[PDB]
């Protein structure tokens, strides 16, 4: 019953440990026991206990004082404030013992904590003058003892204890508030997660009560700039983020303070608010946008900030928003649009990354507008940007189109990617074109796929591509083929004995290859290094020899690039990998072609795949044949296998004309060694070729004849068995049955000129000319129309046309005019044109048939003109009459005739005098005709310039390509035009002018290398010559000289660089002008 300094230390403790129990068990109700123990309660607070050096005593006394507050509440016994302060500070010092969870006394310290927490004893200190020091020291203690050794009951009691002080207190000083917020600072949060969790629990529990002091904290430092208020002033933004996640209400009055800070003129401060709000808005569970719309709208406005880092931050933020907040995606579309056009490359680039990143997670997170933005960026001016957009669309295709990762309806949303990506191959940029190739190899038709799967993929892809897409893909095949050949040529040059000559040849080849590589400024120098390595390392040569061989499988190729890359193991090694991936076969080899033809075979008989693969079995078959036809030109050797030829044989006996027509064309292009390596195929093929060659159809008969010529060494005797029977069947009584025989004979006459020289010569002279072209057994119906579909043409006309094409092939076979046989045919074709198509002039022939005969004769001369030996024979008068076909009364005639000129000129096989004909298209009423004529001129003038740019010129071969040399021909052609009758007439000379201006406007558009000076020097020279078609004819030379002055008037009035010196003295055509004053214009011009 007594505890004092008199008793032994042992007995005192013994008494205390009993006094703890009675105080613990006592009740607030027991007035009796309270009045009794009241004096002991007052005594236990004595300074003898509060400062007792024994740890166990202070603990026991602390527990007592706690219950003593519990029992006597709400009216404690200790009244002295100075004494009441000593107690609660003493208790706080004891709470330090909570830290050692392994001590045997811990549970007593826990009882102390549990008691003051339940009783809210510390609330007594609200009235004490030093309340803030007490509460601050309490908070620091609790946050410094909490560790991973404490269960949730400890955490809970500490929150209860600290919550009361805030909720039921008069105020919260900044100092006291800081003891809580400091635990949230990132540096502290990192080293002490326990104190951090405790602070969160506290702030959450007391959110309503503490909001004003938090609001006051931020308002002082953000708005009023007072940093001295707290040592946590630097961490405000870190704290606002932490606080928002604990409870939104904590920032009730802080969000308006952020909205104000967005309007700040301080770029760095404005940036930080945006960085912050990005995390707040962007977070997955966040709902700040719905809860505070004005802040959301005020935030989105920063997408248009002048400061680049703020824009960049908003753009990076968009990715997270798109992924985490689909419903907010619509508020971003307009801002992502304008930023895709940003002046800063970094912003344009990151708009793509954000849209793609969202798309790759789920395509439904991005709409059509956002993908269209990525599309628009493939045409960006910066390579790094369009590189990002193309790769983006590739990765999207591979997921949501190839693999259908989001269903079938989603794959139709992006059906445009495959086409658009391949259209990029038409770009001038070498970097772009080579990237399309990498994309095609990785993302569209993955190379790592097994052969059969890889061609199944390609087959259905090729069947669903745009028209320009498949064209791009064909051009890609062709370019690699050309490059592989250039490399094999280089290797062969290196293998030669090294002379000064081969050294130069090697440099030329190197220079050509580098034009097909990125960064030609470094490629030229890297290929110098490359040739050096090849001359030395024989083992690297071998590996490249294998990689470039036409029988290189895709497997071997992967091995070859491996070995070469190894033995060169830095920007140099990067360059060669570009070269190696271009030439290395990835898709097409011998086994692939076999798999692909088998895939088309399947499609023809059942297959069941076409329907579920999303393509009509019809167009899939047609595409597969076109694909094989294309690959037969680019990869012919790859068709050389037993499996492929066996598959092609079955295709050749299908009864489907389009399938058989394709198989024949493929055999023609790849069957060069069938007879040697596959004799059973050869013998199986013979009977079919003879059948098709005899019974048609025409198209297949043609291909059959060329197949025999290509494959069989015995082709001579083969042709005999075919020709002689077909030679007999030629009877004018049968018209319908003469089509196929005439076709077959024509191609035989082309491929076997000497073997059948005499029968053909007689055949043409008697049957074609006299018996067939001179009669009209079946007069076509009389009509007003000038043209009819192929169906409605009289079968006799169709035979005449085919008989004309036969004569041309008969001449192209001979390639000589020795026996004056070419003159005869050219004389005949001319009379057909001069008689408007009615060779007999009896009027029994139909008008549409006459049109098709004019077109046939006009087309014939143009084809013969492409053969040098017959070009010599074509007289000016014949050529001039042929030229007038470009202005035929019939639209179809002039259209197709023009198409034939374009084709002859595009292949650089038709002389420029035939390009001058296009000048007469200025007389064409039809807009479409004038457009095509100009199109023809532009394309033909350019390719002739680009060709001369690369290739070294030669005396006679240079005049043939220089576009400027069209002007003399154009001047001559117009001077002889039928409409130009009266020499000095105005309206006729207005016509001559617009014709000249039709070609000159295009020819002069470049204006480089003294083009204009060169032209005027030609025109000057013409005035010093004679018409050559009639040198003595004065009136004819007057007409020549005046057309020159009209031409001269155009040049003078449309340029300023004409008066310069000509680079070279122009040589006029000898057969248009003889070897070399005033103006011949009427003054009204």
């Amino acid at each position: 019953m007594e505890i004092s300094d008199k008793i032994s230390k042992e007995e005192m403790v013994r008494r205390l440990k009993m006094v703890v129990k009675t105080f613990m068990d006592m009740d607030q109700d027991s007035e009796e026991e309270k009045e009794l123990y009241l004096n002991l309660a007052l005594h236990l607070a004595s300074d003898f206990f509060l400062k007792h050096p024994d740890k166990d005593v202070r603990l026991l006394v602390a527990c007592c004082l706690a219950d003593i507050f519990r029992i006597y509440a709400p009216e404690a016994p200790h009244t002295s404030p100075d004494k009441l302060k000593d107690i609660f500070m003493f208790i706080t010092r004891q709470l330090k013992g909570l830290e050692d969870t392994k001590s045997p006394q811990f549970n007593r310290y826990f009882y102390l904590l549990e008691n003051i927490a339940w009783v809210k004893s510390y609330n007594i200190c609200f009235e004490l003058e030093d309340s803030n020091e007490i509460f601050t020291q309490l908070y620091r203690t609790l946050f410094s003892v909490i560790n991973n050794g404490h269960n949730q009951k400890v955490h809970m009691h500490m929150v209860d204890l600290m919550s009361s002080i805030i909720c039921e207190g008069d105020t919260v000083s900044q100092e006291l508030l800081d003891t809580v917020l400091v635990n949230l600072v990132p540096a502290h949060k990192n080293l002490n997660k326990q104190a951090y969790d405790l602070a969160k629990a506290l702030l959450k529990r007391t959110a309503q009560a503490i909001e004003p002091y938090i609001t006051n904290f931020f308002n002082q430092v953000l708005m009023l700039g007072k940093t001295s208020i707290s040592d946590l002033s630097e961490h405000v933004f870190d704290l606002i983020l932490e606080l928002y996640n604990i409870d939104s209400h904590l920032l009730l009055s802080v969000l308006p303070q952020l909205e104000f800070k967005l309007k700040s003129n301080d770029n760095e401060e404005r940036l930080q608010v945006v960085k912050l709000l990005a995390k707040m808005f962007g977070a997955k569970d966040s709902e700040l946008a719905s809860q505070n719309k004005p802040l959301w709208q005020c935030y989105l406005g920063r997408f248009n900030d002048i400061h680049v880092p703020i824009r960049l931050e908003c753009v990076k933020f968009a990715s997270h928003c798109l992924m985490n907040h689909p419903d907010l995606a619509k508020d971003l579309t307009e801002y992502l649009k304008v930023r895709s056009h940003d002046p800063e490359e970094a912003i344009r680039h990151d708009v793509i990354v954000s849209i793609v990143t969202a798309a790759k997670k789920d395509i439904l997170l991005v709409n059509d507008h956002l993908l269209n933005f990525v599309r628009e960026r493939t045409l960006d001016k910066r390579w790094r940007v369009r590189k990002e957009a193309m790769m983006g669309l590739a990765q999207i295709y591979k997921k949501y189109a190839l693999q259908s990762a989001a269903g079938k309806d989603a794959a139709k949303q992006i059906a445009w990617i495959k086409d658009k990506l391949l259209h990029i191959y038409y770009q001038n940029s070498i970097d772009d074109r080579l990237l399309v190739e990498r994309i095609f190899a990785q993302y569209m038709v993955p190379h790592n796929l097994e052969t059969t799967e890889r061609m199944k993929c390609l087959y259905y892809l090729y069947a669903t591509l745009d028209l320009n897409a498949v064209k791009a893909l064909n051009e890609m095949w062709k370019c690699q083929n050309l490059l592989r050949h250039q490399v094999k040529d280089l290797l062969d040059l290196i293998k030669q004995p090294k002379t000064d000559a081969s050294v130069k040849a090697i440099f030329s080849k190197v220079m050509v290859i580098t034009r097909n590589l990125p960064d030609p400024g470094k490629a030229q120098d890297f290929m110098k290094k490359f040739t050096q390595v090849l001359e030395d390392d024989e083992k690297i040569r071998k590996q490249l020899e294998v990689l470039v061989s036409p029988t290189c499988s895709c497997k071997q190729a992967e091995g070859c690039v491996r070995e070469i890359t190894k033995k060169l193991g830095n920007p140099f090694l990067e360059m060669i990998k570009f070269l190696l991936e271009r030439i290395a076969p990835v898709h097409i080899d011998t086994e692939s072609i076999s798999a692909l033809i088998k895939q088309v075979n399947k499609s023809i008989d059942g297959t069941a795949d076409d329907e579920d693969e999303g393509v009509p079995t019809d167009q899939a078959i047609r595409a597969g044949l076109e694909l094989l036809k294309v690959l037969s030109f680019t990869h012919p050797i790859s068709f050389h296998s037993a499996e492929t030829f066996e598959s092609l044989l079955a295709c050749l006996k299908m009864d489907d004309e389009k399938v058989a027509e394709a198989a024949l064309q493929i055999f023609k292009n790849t069957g060069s060694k069938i007879e040697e390596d596959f004799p059973h195929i050869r013998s199986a093929l013979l009977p079919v070729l003879h059948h098709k060659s005899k019974k048609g159809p025409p198209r297949q008969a043609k291909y059959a004849i060329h197949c025999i010529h290509a494959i069989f060494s015995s082709k001579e005797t083969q042709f005999a068995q075919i020709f002689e029977p077909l030679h007999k069947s030629l009877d004018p009584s049968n018209l319908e049955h003469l089509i196929t025989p005439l076709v077959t004979i024509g191609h035989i006459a082309l491929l076997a000129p000497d073997q059948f020289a005499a029968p053909l010569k007689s055949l043409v002279a008697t049957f074609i000319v006299k018996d067939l072209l001179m009669n009209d057994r079946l007069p076509g119906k009389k009509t007003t129309k000038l043209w009819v579909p192929d169906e409605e043409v009289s079968p006799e006309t169709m035979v005449k046309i085919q008989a004309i094409k036969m004569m041309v092939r008969w001449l192209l076979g001979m390639k000589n005019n020795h026996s004056k046989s070419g003159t005869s045919t050219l004389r005949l074709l001319t009379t057909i044109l001069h008689s408007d198509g009615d060779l007999t002039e009896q009027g029994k022939i139909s008008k549409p048939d006459m049109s098709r005969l004019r077109l046939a004769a006009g087309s014939a001369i143009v084809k013969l003109a492409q053969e040098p030996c017959y070009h010599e024979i074509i007289t000016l008068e014949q050529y001039q009459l042929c030229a007038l076909a470009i202005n035929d009364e019939c639209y179809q005639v002039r259209q197709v005739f023009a198409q034939k000129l374009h084709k002859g000129l595009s292949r650089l096989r038709l002389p420029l005098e035939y390009m001058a004909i296009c000048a007469l298209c200025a007389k064409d009423p039809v807009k479409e005709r004038r457009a095509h004529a100009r199109q023809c001129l532009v394309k033909n003038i350019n390719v002739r310039r680009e060709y001369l740019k690369q290739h070294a010129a030669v005396s006679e071969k240079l005049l043939s390509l220089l576009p400027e040399y069209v002007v003399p021909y154009t001047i001559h052609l117009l001077a002889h035009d039928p409409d130009y009758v009266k020499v000095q007439d105005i309206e006729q000379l207005k016509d001559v002018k617009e014709c000249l201006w039709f070609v000159l406007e295009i020819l002069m558009a470049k204006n480089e290398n003294n083009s204009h000076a060169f032209i005027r020097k030609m025109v000057e020279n013409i005035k010093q010559t004679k018409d050559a078609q009639g040198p003595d004819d004065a009136k004819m030379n007057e007409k020549l000289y005046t057309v020159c002055d009209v031409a001269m008037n155009i040049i003078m009035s449309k340029s300023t660089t004409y008066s310069l010196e000509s680079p070279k003295d122009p040589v006029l055509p000898a057969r248009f002008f003889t070897q070399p004053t005033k103006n011949y214009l009427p003054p009204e011009m």
Binding site: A73, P74, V119, K120, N123, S164, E168, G169
Partner: peptide, 5 residues
């Protein structure tokens, strides 16, 4: 019974 305000 406890201390509250």
């Amino acid at each position: 019974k406890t201390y509250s305000r």
